[PDB]
């Protein structure tokens, strides 16, 4: 078949990691407006019947621990998985409050052989974060 099976009892988890304030030591700025994103995402996804869990201001260790635990939950009754990351970034990197987390480390928990209740199911990572500091000047069209 051409389409993912979406008529499992539950649409799935929508995990939102909303990092707004960062340790002084890291020198990272307060992310004004991230709360507007977080609320907008919760409304949108709960309306799609996702089970929305919202997490605010996690350290790098807390993000990894969160993702490990979630990947070890029973997703057998869930059609999909959504994870939204709202933070500072660099290429390949999302920031916890105290420092950088490797995106590949986060997502590896949900690999087909490591999270077996999500094997064959769509795993959606939505990443609102910088991928560097390049600016696109655009072109007239």
């Amino acid at each position: 078949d051409n389409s993912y099976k979406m008529d499992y009892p539950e649409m799935g988890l929508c995990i939102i990691i909303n990092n707004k304030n960062f340790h002084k030591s890291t020198g990272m700025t307060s992310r004004s407006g991230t709360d507007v994103d977080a609320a907008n995402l919760r409304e949108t996804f709960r309306n799609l019947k996702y089970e929305v869990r919202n997490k605010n201001d996690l350290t790098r260790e807390e993000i990894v621990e969160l993702m490990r635990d979630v990947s070890k939950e029973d997703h057998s009754k869930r059609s999909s998985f959504v994870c939204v990351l709202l933070s500072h970034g660099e290429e390949g990197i999302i920031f916890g409050t105290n420092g950088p987390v490797d995106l590949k480390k986060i997502t590896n928990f949900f690999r087909g052989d490591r999270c077996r209740s999500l094997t064959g199911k769509p795993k959606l990572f939505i990443i609102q974060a910088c991928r560097g500091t390049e600016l696109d000047c655009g072109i007239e069209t």
Partner: protein
């Protein structure tokens, strides 16, 4: 939007308009979407007395734009000694780095501001 007007009056060097907007409750830490603050603008454009009245009313001396540039970086780039002096007095971080890994000190070397390299 008092915040926007303030950023605008600051860029324009309008010390009186700056003062009136502040008396009216304008956020001295207003920001555009790139993290540019009134202090960044005043420091870059050489508006010494605006720099002083912003710092007096709680402008964040160490605010950085999306390229990690602080007011100290910008004052350093144009070589405004008095503004650099005032920022340092308000506890500007000489050891804060921008995107290119460059310090306010490092800029003083690049632009050859012999006189800037000590404070």
């Amino acid at each position: 939007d008092l915040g926007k007007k303030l950023l605008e009056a600051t860029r324009a060097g309008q010390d009186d308009e700056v003062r009136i907007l502040m008396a009216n409750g304008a956020d001295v830490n207003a920001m555009d979407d790139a993290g540019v603050t009134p202090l960044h603008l005043a420091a870059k454009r050489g508006h010494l007395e605006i720099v002083e009245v912003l710092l007096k009313h709680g402008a964040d001396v160490n605010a950085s734009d999306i390229w990690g540039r602080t007011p100290l970086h910008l004052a350093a780039t144009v070589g405004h000694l008095e503004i650099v002096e005032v920022l340092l007095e308000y506890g500007a971080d000489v050891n804060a780095q921008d995107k290119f890994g460059k310090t306010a000190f490092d800029i003083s070397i690049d632009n050859g501001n012999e006189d800037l390299a000590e404070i």
